[PDB]
Design a protein around this ligand. Structure first.
Ligand SMILES: CC(=O)N[C@H]1[C@@H](Oc2ccc([N+](=O)[O-])cc2)O[C@H](CO)[C@H](O)[C@@H]1O
Lengths: 210, 217
């Protein structure tokens, strides 16, 4: 019994209605919903299709029958942003891939920051130049590097954070990983941060030392 | 105070075995059916096994042969014996309880299993300071990068708990059997360069715990 949760990731502003949906391969007596937030176990949330777990706000409801089910937050709250797995145990236990609820914010551009290798890293014989594109929204960003003006996109370790609890913005960490031999063969090292907020990028560079 | 507490998640090579102990408290264990459910690094939940109050085991076909669900009803403990591991068997392993017809009502916080041919390599520590007298205006950001460690995970801090707002600590990415992990922090241009800052980082396996204050220029 494959359970199917479309969409896998969505967004809503506090106050809006949110309806997640779960569709069973084949008919089942009951669906059960688990809320998981990052760095915890899933908590049981709505069970036996309808029945709210103790603790769970009245804004949450669970409807459905046979083969289609839906969980509905009546009045979205920042509080409710988590991944919501659906689950059946009528035939062999299974889960959905879960839809992920993120909090819709106003658009923000990022506080970009480029940093040339530490002395102990340059010592070891390998350069890694870090760009912290911090506190933007939407999630959706692409960064491109230019090793002496020419677009070089190899050795690039990108890593995002889960949406912020306070500001509900995303943040990213780009790491261009060269060698010392390679780092001692160029001058300019720039950091092109392209985002929805402006047509004009937000650059931050350093021509090696001084 | 219904408590479930998983144990003995580690690194072991493809083909080796491992025993997970889940320890129950705050409810009559023997009245509840217990289950293992694992979450893959990409957050897909997968039922592994379930054992009856009456010691009846249930398994899906992919899990039968290599997994043995079992319980101690007297010292209330649940056990998963995993044998001959694949890279697929890398996940969080949560124990959880259901009563009867009912669905799982409470999950432990899970023990972490990673199975790969990579070796306990310690992390390396380098800070990141940009300012030599420029963008010394509104605020400044400091950085703390850790490169090439195994296994995951690693835990950090800024001045042993100080900074809550402004801290960003990014999820480890794998290059090739080597994990690298960055973290940042923003401050008023008043507090830096004055209050010198040090990110404490500790690796579980190697037990390595080198500190590194952020340098001036
Ligand atoms: C996780 C969970 O929900 N686990 C429980 C669920 O497991 C089942 C349910 C159905 C099948 N099946 O159709 O082959 C196999 C195992 O029900 C069992 C009987 O109620 C046990 O209580 C078990 O602890």
């Amino acid at each position: 019994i494959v359970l199917t949760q479309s969409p896998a990731i969505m967004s809503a502003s506090p106050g809006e209605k949110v309806t997640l949906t779960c569709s069973a391969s084949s008919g089942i007596g009951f669906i059960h919903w688990y809320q998981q937030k990052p760095g915890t176990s899933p908590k049981r949330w709505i069970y036996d299709t309808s029945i709210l777990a103790s603790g769970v706000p009245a804004r949450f409801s669970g409807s459905g029958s046979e083969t289609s089910y839906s969980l509905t937050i009546t009045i979205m709250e920042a509080e409710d942003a988590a991944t919501y797995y659906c689950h059946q145990r009528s035939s062999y236990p299974t889960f959905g891939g879960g839809t992920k609820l993120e909090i819709k914010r106003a658009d923000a551009a990022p506080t970009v920051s480029i940093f040339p290798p530490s002395s102990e890293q340059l010592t070891s014989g390998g350069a890694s130049v870090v760009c912290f594109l911090n506190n933007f929204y939407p999630k959706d960003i692409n960064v491109k590097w230019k090793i002496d003006g020419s677009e070089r996109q190899n050795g690039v370790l990108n890593s995002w954070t889960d949406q912020d609890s306070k500001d509900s913005t995303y943040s990213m960490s780009s790491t261009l990983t060269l060698t010392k031999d390679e780092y001692e063969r160029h001058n300019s090292y720039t950091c092109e941060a392209t985002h929805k907020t402006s047509t004009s990028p937000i650059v931050k560079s350093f021509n090696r030392n001084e | 105070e219904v408590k479930l507490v998983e144990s003995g998640g580690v690194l072991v090579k493809p083909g080796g075995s491992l025993k997970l102990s889940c320890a129950a408290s705050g409810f009559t264990f023997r009245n509840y059916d217990m289950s293992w459910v694992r979450q893959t690094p990409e957050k897909r939940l997968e039922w592994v096994a379930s054992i009856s109050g009456g010691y009846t085991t249930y398994y899906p076909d992919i899990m039968r042969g290599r997994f043995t669900i079992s319980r101690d009803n007297v010292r209330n403990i649940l056990y998963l014996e995993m044998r001959s591991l694949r890279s697929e068997d890398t996940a969080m392993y949560y124990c959880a309880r259901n009563y009867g017809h009912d669905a799982m009502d409470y999950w432990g916080q899970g023990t972490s299993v990673t199975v790969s041919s990579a070796k306990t390599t310690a992390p390396s520590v380098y800070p990141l300071a940009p300012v030599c007298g420029d963008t010394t205006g509104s605020s400044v950001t400091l950085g703390c990068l850790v490169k090439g460690y195994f296994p995951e995970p690693v835990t950090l801090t800024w001045n042993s708990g100080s900074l809550s707002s402004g801290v960003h600590t990014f999820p480890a990415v794998l290059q090739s059997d080597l994990y690298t992990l960055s973290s940042s922090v923003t401050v008023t241009s008043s507090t830096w360069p004055s209050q010198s800052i040090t990110c404490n980082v500790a690796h579980p396996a190697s037990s390595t715990k080198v500190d590194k204050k952020i340098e001036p220029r």
